[model samples]
Target chain A: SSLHPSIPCPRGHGAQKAALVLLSACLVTLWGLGEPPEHTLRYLVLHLASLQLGLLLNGVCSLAEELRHIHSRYRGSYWRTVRACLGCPLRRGALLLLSIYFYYSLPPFTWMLALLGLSQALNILLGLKGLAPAEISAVCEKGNFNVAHGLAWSYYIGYLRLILPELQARIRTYNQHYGAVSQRLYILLPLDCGVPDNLSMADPNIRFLDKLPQQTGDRAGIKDRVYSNSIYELLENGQRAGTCVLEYATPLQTLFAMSQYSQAGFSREDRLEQAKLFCRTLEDILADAPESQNNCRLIAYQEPSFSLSQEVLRHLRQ
Target chain B: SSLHPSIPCPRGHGAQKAALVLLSACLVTLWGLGEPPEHTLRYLVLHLASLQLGLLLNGVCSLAEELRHIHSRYRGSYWRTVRACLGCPLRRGALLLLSIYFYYSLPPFTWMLALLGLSQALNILLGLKGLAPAEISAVCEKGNFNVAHGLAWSYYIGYLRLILPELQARIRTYNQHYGAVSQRLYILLPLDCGVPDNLSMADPNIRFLDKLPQQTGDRAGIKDRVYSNSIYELLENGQRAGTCVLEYATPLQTLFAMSQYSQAGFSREDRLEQAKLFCRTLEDILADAPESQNNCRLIAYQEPSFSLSQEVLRHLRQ
Candidate 1:
């Protein structure tokens, strides 16, 4: 959906661009005075080591599906602890300390050295916390793929799972608020077998699906393909076909568009709050948005707390 | 493998921790000053919109497999053009300019404002270049799994296609350099045709394999699972049993291990340089090491690249 949203905003005045030059000078004066150069010739060494760790970390747990799970599972108490305890103090402190160091350290780029010096300091704290580099599995890609798909179906279906009943009961709720214009709204149900081809949820209530007689519209995001039930039996068999898709009606696009439109006008802080609220709204609609698929089983978007790496870490520690 | 390398560097004196304080100060001043109460509380609104765009972009192209293709395909001149022509001069200029504006602006975090502002500025250049948020597809996970298998085979095999013969010739080179230790290096080939009844790539070598009973030891990096081949008929199947693996043993782990260790000592810049170079060495060996995957080909790595939203962007654009 037009990533890098194109919105009209005021152009920069000469004052703004000119302000940057003054900004550069002030920075120069500050770094000129604060402190003498020391630990580096410095993190030129430390920086690389961090990059190395970052690279290794990326390689090991670089799976997006895994990231999604971490994020979804991290909704409640941990968020509070991180906000009130660990994160709040550090972010606030970092802001104060860095301003002084940048002004104090002049060329040879002592400013950078101080930053890394400090970051490793944080690492020391992390180190004391058992150097939380828990062992993780690269895991069988195929194995993980199954779990990820279940999640895709879970969240997508989970949303429909909630939205569908409401819309089914009050079709006009969407029509009135979300620009569904026509009283007709289509909900897409993807059939997955928990395992790829099992398609036990092939029951696409044909009456409800392909049922969008009014809104013959499309979804506009990238890689926007959704595979679904069999044309014949309506079972999503990924055998001869090897794919399944779930397509919702135009009203959903309107929903997304409305979000885009509404946010364009919010004030700075309010915008962030609104965006967060927007996400929570969707979460609320989907009853907190963790999902289950098929009828009796196949919890697709199950919010497991730890990642495969975290799992591996615990396994290793044990 | 250990994601974070355990290293012993000079202990942080109060000097080291203080260095971090400087770093934080550096960042703080830049953001703090760029602070002039000028922008009319406008940027926060822009910030959220950009975030919305960023989120959409993430959903569409979060594939490691695709990332690899981009890196691979971007070899000779195009990389130079993007950097020299489009990127170089501007980024350097902006960093210097923004740091000042941030420092000058007194309160409420101008550093972030400058960053967000600058990021959007780059977007203008990108937009001018017609690098629009192109539409994409989430195709068959299982269908693509086979194609990805073909690539993994092409690469691992193609390398094998080259190395096996050379090893067959120099024999001891495998022993000396590659660490077959015993002239036995096991090669792993995976056959992931669904249902396990399918064991594709059963052909390791009518003449091409049986090459490595000599290199003993297993692969250490993980997922060391290469599901395929036969011994009774001597087959690797992923169906009925649904999978077969071919794991090759040699000093490959040593090679990977050596890479891990070598960086431990290299200067930060050199380490990245060498990491890049180490890759080139492999590339030089089999060829210049750009096998950066995912950007994934498992649904190509869990297969969520396409959703219906992606479809509409294209459908509408078309």
Candidate 2:
């Protein structure tokens, strides 16, 4: 009933128990080797050997898995098993060559030493965690310690499972904020929202009437006032986010057209007068219920491009 | 006579006497400021204002010197006087801008602040030195102090002097060594140097012989070595200080020729063998050298490029 001939198992087990024993022995050996005092040559050789052994073990495990798959499925192709073994050796050789090259060529002793220490620490911790129940019980009996010590250590390791998710969330949030700031400001706006779809797709009257509340102190104005006052409340309920989703069709083209009009000697005073008239004309097209908040804010700015100085000048000229 | 028309020279018979009185007054004022026990805003303001006044006085002194130059040459031509004044102001303005920018932009704030403090200390020391009886006592005093202080302060400021020469020597030496390594490897010897006004410009033997000795030694390995060495020596001696004389000539184009040969499948090894044969052929050309030395010794290990490994391989193969 023994799974492996090399190591005899208890009556109930076979190959699985033998494999577990072999894996445990390998881990223990690696951990013992890792615990030596630090020095450049000793450290490098030990780590290099460990890496080679680990790679070999991985390759062997993969080959075994592939062989098992082939045996389980009698119809499995012969090439699949052969290719698996062939790939494992080539990959192992390549990794070995790369590691050798990297070990010698890189400079700065401190960084390399730090990497060695960190790897050793991780290996030792993982090895201890994976130790068989017999090993743990032996330690307890030899030291005459209570079972609580072993249980506490196991719990401490398990605590990392809870912390990792929170850490990941924090990092994700930081990356998102960083990406938002680092993105080119002009490209993110108008273009990201698809200006042409926003401007021309919607009713012209809906868009124009939306601005009326921001301009005048009417019932629409009262609604605008109420929304501004309760913006935080709306945000708290997750209702305010992306509320201003109305598409602006050809926004850049529209701005370019206005710039061209101004450049064509359409006197500054006359331009302002015409722009005000145009804003009024759009009021009929923008008469709306919801989703007019942004349009109203834009109208409040007096000009499409928000500049306090321009707003004051436009008011003064008017 | 009055130095300024508004104020008489305090009936002083000698410049030394006037300078002593000025120094004494400055010392007294500084002492008064420093002796104040209370840290009042008014006192701090007064101290700052006095320092500003001192700066203005220094500016006035420099302006007086410029005016003196203009006045002395005023009788020559009206245009010349105007040109002198215009050029002086422009140069002064440029110096002011450069000084301010340099002062603000220098790194390692401690060193910069130390230098600033030292400059102020030197100014005060110079003022004290000016109180001597001799008219040119300030120069004598400053020269003596500079010779002593320069030695002490050189350690701090020496980096400024060392950088330029180190850079120049490194670049030149690198070029020479690189060229020698290339030539010795039998990489297509670039055809640039020739016999002095001879009819055999295209003769490889003649060109090789002419360049062999120069290419062998560190002194002659670099292009324009002799001229640069002479110029640098003169500059170091202070005879040609603040002056640069540049001479232009064609470099041997070693890399260009070698790259061309490499492209043609003239393997690095083959090129190196050819270089060795070329070197042997030119032995007789350098036969008249002293018993202790030969051209080969001079040219040994010199390469034409920064890549040491490649250059060494090329030379060894040749």
Candidate 3:
């Protein structure tokens, strides 16, 4: 049910989230003012103000974070910076008005609230002590990876940390029952899963990936020919796994880059060709069987002199 | 000797930290620019830029968080927010200028830098999801703990989570050798220790507090008397222990309040009276001995109906 990488998904859903927050606040505010008793009225009003004030405070922090993001990610692009900068005062003023109301309403608690604000802010600044290097490489460097490896690493971390253990346990039981020399399972997933939408029972990609392992049928043993043709048909000479596995692991930014860079053979077709080439390389790695059992092999497209081969199971233990 | 809480401690030490950062950057920048060969020059220059750019991005995010804190905690005070707002542009401008230099020098890496910035910023925002309620009760509210419980909780958490286990081990060994029905430990500390300064071997307060436990010569366990007079001499009719335990747990703001509130007996002397009163109460709790072996009792000054009593050891287990 998911579209290919080329088919663009809607953006700016962040605004939708923001609007919902505002809508909830107003609804709660109006509800508070409408026919609640007088004593409770002031209490409710102050509480409501507190609630919105909290949100406004959070929103301001968010905008502040956005400012940092604008600087770091977009290198402070003119429009993005200006837009983010605009949010500061607009929200700040809202906060000021709300706070003034809060102060008039709750004078005794002002200092406490201020202390809380300062501590939380300081907490954020401290937490962001060492920002990690960019996972996506945009330009030419001596040892830079051409494509973003964040998705791959994310997938690897998720699989090893979360999914692989369950898979390994299942594979072990399957092997015990079948009494095969070796056992393997294969799985495939849609690219959208890479968006980091938490995998769940209802997600089609998750469901499909989950079921793929159980359906490996008689192919538990004799682990040669790892890149099954059925999976190829799904990706059209693209990528997959055996209880061996595969991850396309492309970030949205990389996808757009590929769509545009296609003019220089950096296109979808080009990426597909590279994917096919990588699969061949991966197949060879998989055929190394006993040697490759818990190993991971990565082939980064368009990234010459770059690949990752590691006994990741050992890494998982570490 | 520590001054009364009314005498404000030096602030704007934040500017000192910031200046240290800038000064370090300039020193490093000049060092890189000085006679470092051509290859190393660009690399070091780019790296220096990256470091400063990271700081700039961090600074921007900090201002943003400060903005929210101002709103939520301060209710968005004018002077603080304006001062914070001014920081956004100045650092942002620094980031932009640096990025442009970075782009001209290393065009291929601009987007990578940008991606790094954004991720780190988002990381900060996400981590700050839920801030705690203000520990200090500023206004009159029914059933609000007048004093900030944060310090007490913080001290409790620290003692139980980190310190108490070690102390218990010591007391157990001491009891084992001394052949007493029970053994207790006492500790005393200064208000400055409440600044959340990382306790160290070099700290005088830490040194004093650490030694107090071993000083209980023959007072192993009859547990009849709790507050020792020598400790009272130190605090002047104040407080302390008998293998019991005590914590003043006053935050700096509370200190200042005690100084001014003296007119209403909220003064230092008033606090001392309350402290003396609480100690008498604590001595009773401690005299409960076999019953109070691993219990905790708290009496808050000026907070009429607020007190804490619990079997903290059992609570710690849970």
Candidate 4:
């Protein structure tokens, strides 16, 4: 009944890192050569206006979320007390006064430098919130957890275990409100350690779903998590008693073994294609049984699209 | 087999119009009062940079799409010739020189005024591209065709018949490439004409699909289009011979009648809920039969999530 598939994480490259720099340089060159210098200045002014507004709003929101995270994650700790004091209005007021004084005293060139600092500040905020393209690339490159990635995944996992209590509750709420019963939890880690597979294989009753076309074995380059349907149904029926947690090796470790496999010589582009196919196969299977109240509706190994703002806003509000 | 549903367009009001203005004013107030004017100015500069680059790129690409649309939509017309000349580099170069003159000759205050104008120019581009929130509201309010809305819907319809040739072709491409086969066509128009329904009912071979739960009559507040599966199959089989087009009265006319219904007393919030339910039901049914290469997978009455940039980029490239 498992909807899980072998979604191998794509490797990151130096070329991908340079692509961002190349795009930025090209845009800057175009700005200098095209139109009047004053028009360019005006254009930059408008861009700055939007950037400032967006950063201020996003920063304040992130700060509020951080306060909550620190309190909950480090309850009774000295760091919690210090973080609370840092967000107090008294310190913020004093900081504002100092900023005003500096603004009055500093030369225009100094003001320009401050603007560059503000731009960097916005970038930092974007990274912390996991909205930056670079952050997404970092995680999807190898499905390995960086600090941001850890926070991103763990936040959802923790919320489900503590606050939401069960994934079924989320599914019910979505069905009642949004009329959607689908709940896809991505297991993007590698399968090197038998981990879930090992556990499932140890259970003699484990059954694999081969009901539809292209659903059999790993022959089609997609792997499914093996699990007993009886166990899954029993857990669903006995939700009041307990819950289960699953884990696997990180994608980085898997790539090490994947490179040595007989079918390991795929070009980067082909690897990306296989990654996509893995996701789509599960999507098709899930769509085929949309109303199924089984384990097939939940867990998978493919990476889901991330939207930090929407996730935080909804999770906090709930 | 029809998935047509009664999706009454909500009315747009002055309250909605002021919402945008109010949000902008509040953001400006916060920026001015926050800390330092110098920082504010710097923030604005970066905003302007992004804004200018976005406008230039989007504007140029839009111009390219418009050129193709003019040639195909208005073939053998004088307007096409005029439009072609308008996009030439010589004219653009002259405009650039004029802008340079204005940039150098204008005072600082005049330069500020030009910045405001540049902001308006971007607004214009957003409207033309139908990416603005205001534009979405306008179309959804009455299901009426404004210039932008007409272009948005007709662009897809025209492309299907003239370029892609069939809805099935797009579905196949989506499956083969992106691994999705859902093809929904929104009939935002009202049911007053009973155009498609009337045609089907007249034929006497029309059949209704009332198989799944809540698939009966419009009791659940979702209406289905009435059509024959035989005709649909024949068309699918004879794709080389011809194609078909369908139309109906728009939402504006439907609303006038909808207000008189027994359910008309429902609040705007409830009506919006029904609209959502209508979409989700079809989504469920379509997901239930994802591999069905039939008409059921093709058409519906729902406003889709639009991305003008993605649409233009892909369509132009294809």
Candidate 5:
């Protein structure tokens, strides 16, 4: 039976699940203390976490097998063992905790924070990855993922999530035409993907007219553009849908944007908090969405500042 | 006057010069063997060389002052003590040697030679100082006199001297245009001495175009067109007058044109060598001509590469 009891009863419940949970909790506790006796506790925690992750992976594979069995003309015992594990609430909880720790420990959060500040400062001082309108336009038109990703990761992510919304809202508040906001937003994304592989995926909608051939040349242009556009569309959709729930409110967005505008670089606390907020909002938007849908798609199709932290967390855990 | 009579003068000298040379040799020998015995012989050579250079600076200033006295009605020594000693030969030579040593001593050349080559390989990769085009350009265009003179002396006086008439004949054989040759030769000489305070007396004709603002908004554009038509005209005139000679038969004009065709960056060695060759040829063509006839005259035109070497040497000596 499940510990929550509100859900369907898990097939194999008591001792095994309790044992696994106790082991995992012990490991986590030891890891967190990080005191003199556990000076190497962080390493120990990482090792335990890895072990737990391996177990979680096996558990997930087993669940997949069970699903396959349920679909088939009742096949082998592979699904049976997997179903038993999935039924174990302790295992699920252990896995969830493990994933949360793993994702939090990842460099993405720090990198995102650093990148957010850096990109903002760079955008202000250098402007849109230090590129010209023509250059940015060319990169965007070519559907260069590397360049797009670089610029996105470098500068525009915050702008899209934080600044653009505020700008759009201001225009709306003033009863202004959406053309200026749209045009300026379009200009912010550069078209040149430095990497050939990404450049090959050009979208048909965007125009990358330039003297020099795109990095991947003409043939690759179509695919690159499509891939990039799809990703952009996804994010755009998510933003539109989650605008009410997401915290891309004027004050918050202003605070986020200010980090970039300031010369001193963004405060770490603000960056981490903003990232958390963005991620959380994104997660809530995609809670019941099909796995086929990407996080970006969910956000883009909705509100500009909608978060996907929950979905990202779920994906990482699963 | 001169001390070492038995020592045959090398084509350009007499006894006082010879005595000065011997005294220089003795001081150099002593300095080479002196205290701080652990100090490199190269550094010692640099120290003694610097002293000799100070004396040379004094001599050159004295000569220039004498010339000014002959020409001017009221002459009270052009410079109080010729601060151009900052651009001294000894310092430049020392710095050059030191740079060479430092560049060769580090990296990819070390254990990582397989993966990276030498530590100095980074100089090529990251395009630092001597490696980067803009940096190289800076050195060529704005380096102190010590660097300029030392590089010129090393390349021209030391290396080119051995291959002169052959080099001259080779150039003459290929370049048959009399107008080009005349312009080159004439430009090498200073001319029309209205003596604008802004222009150096050494080369009054070398005027910085008034149209070019110090801080142009279009930096990239300016950088792109730095070697434009006017530059071509300057080069063409210098070449025609025999004032500027391409050491190798590679057309100086073509080379000048090619210098502007930088892909990502300017080639340091090629650009610097070209600049040096141009300066040297200009100096040679105008060697016996009146200072009043030179087109472009730099007060303390120094070579960056050589001056860099000298700075390093001075640091070592101290």
Candidate 6:
């Protein structure tokens, strides 16, 4: 009853997958070491070393990606949280040891390099075998997205390419969801599907991420909007009163910078209110000081410019 | 009398090409500085820096690849040697300054990288437009080949796959050059046509790189043989005096390793005789020594396995 048709939902697939990979690795390692020192052993060792190195980078990073989406989507599910708690940290340790060997592959930088970037793409998907059909469908639909697309204001080529296609897909999915204004409105940051970032998802702020109305067009038909949003010059936002260079400034300024999504709910009037609230907060802050800026627009987490205000955070803790 | 048809002998192409590259560089540099500190300037500087970095690597290193081949082949030419001395060193200073401007582009690594490897493949060809007819054909052949191939190799993927392929081709080329009885013959070193450390090109000693009765069959018919040779073990030596290991080796162990290619000229009877002489030499070394076999069998450089004797070289040199 908890399951859906069309999904095989095979038993022990995860452990079976693990056993398969391990078995193959063991077989290869045996073959690599079976012979004495000649051309064979040297070459076998070099290839195994390089292959492992690639596995190492992607293996660990993708686990973090999997957990971020899982936890973000299934936040209230006791079992999912328990599973993440029980499973992720341990897998991380396992992946850590694996990549340490990746590091240890004795400087065959050439082949080692080829494997590294390829590892993580295939990684996050492995976590999917355990989800329910509908949630699985929605989440799997966004599986193509990588949070790294939000990374830099200036960029060209890479993991970001994977993101654009998926983001467009998410925008497509959202258009299919509960039906919002398709013409004047579009999905901004997608936290519900659990791509990594610090931004609002389901709901809207009263205003645009930038103050301009231009950031609001339905992106499907908008080429310039898509191009600039996907890759841009310095993620252009002008002065927020006080000194808040939030938005893209980043906790991603945290590192390897991927897959952790979070967001609040959205409705158009709510977004408009969100913007007005932000404008009010900025005005309030600037009332006392001329040039000072506060990083958040409304001192609220959902504001695009909201950074984890350490000052506010400390005061709250106190 | 010296000219060959079907080859266009272009005069001053090298100088003309250099001038074209230089004029563009100057004009871009002027634009780069014509305005300051805004978007255009920032991008200009970023691009120029990246462009310089690419130029720098190809500038220095391709010159090394070219010099190795040129000097290795042209050891007898006075004009070639003198031109290399006068030309390369000074050009380094000039390109160093030019690439410093490229480096000045700041940090656009991707596009900068694309341009870098391209420069030298095209650059080295420029050096060739002035060469004498016959030599020009051989050198120019290598030139066009490197141009398309260099770009992808700059980042990764294409160039390397090509390397693995041509290396197979070089082995193909070597197998085509000569053949002798494989059962008793062994070659131990190769001194020319360096296709990395592990391939053969142009000719072989006593056999093809692989051993099997059917290995003699031209490989276009046999997929297995071709694959095995490109990525394989066992140099295919039938046997050695008490224990031989020859895949792709040479008879520099037999005096002339080049032009006269005397080892091949030595008949089947003499090659057998030469093997016996090697066996005797090896036995003599083993008779007194233990735990350390020579790097080669005959060590008249003579701690028994000494292959690189100034004694051997001086005679060969004379």
Candidate 3 lDDT tens digits, A30-71: 546754323332454466656555555555676666767876
lDDT of 1 by residue, A70-161 (tens): 44655544444344333343443454343233333322445544565565456554663242221111222224322223433444454455
Instruction: Count clashes in each candidate, considering only residues at least 3 apart in sequence or on different chains.
Output: 109, 39, 20, 21, 100, 42
Ten residues in sequence with the least summed lDDT for candidate 4 chain B = B227-236
List model 6 lDDT by residue over B11-90, tens digit each: 33455456556655654564567543233333544555555455455445545545665647667564464445445433
Give the CA lDDT, 0 to 100, for residue A35 in model 4: 71
Best by DockQ: 1
Q: Give TM-scores of chain A for all candidates.
A: 0.20, 0.18, 0.26, 0.26, 0.19, 0.20
Instruction: Write down the TM-score for model 2.
Output: 0.15
TM-score of 3: 0.22
| Model 2 chain B poorest ten-residue lDDT run | B243-252
TM-score of chain B of each: 0.19, 0.19, 0.27, 0.26, 0.18, 0.20
Q: Which prediction has more favorable lDDT, 1 or 6?
A: 6
Interface RMSDs of the predictions, in order, are: 14.4, 34.4, 23.5, 30.1, 14.8, 26.2
TM-score for the B chain of model 4: 0.26
Those runs of model 6 whose alpha carbons end farther than 4 Å from true positions after fitting are A1-318, B1-237, B240-318
lDDT, model 5, position B183: 18
Of the two candidates 1 and 5, the one with more favorable lDDT, higher being better, is: 5
Candidate 5 residue-wise lDDT, A1-318, digit = tens: 111122122134465799999989986876787755444555566556555554555556456556666536345565455547565666667776865576577424445335445544554443333567545534543463222234233333332343333433343443352111121222111111111222214222221221111122123345533111111221232342111112112223333443444332445454433333333333343344342133222122122332333332222234
Please identify model 1 stretches exceeding 4 Å from their true place.
Answer: A1-80, A83-92, A98-318, B1-91, B94-228, B232-318
Sliding window of 10 residues with minimal summed lDDT for model 5 chain B: B185-194
Distance from true position, residue B130, model 3, in Å? 40
Q: What's the DockQ for every one of the candidates?
A: 0.06, 0.01, 0.01, 0.02, 0.01, 0.01
Give candidate 3's error at residue B307 in angstroms. Answer: 4.6
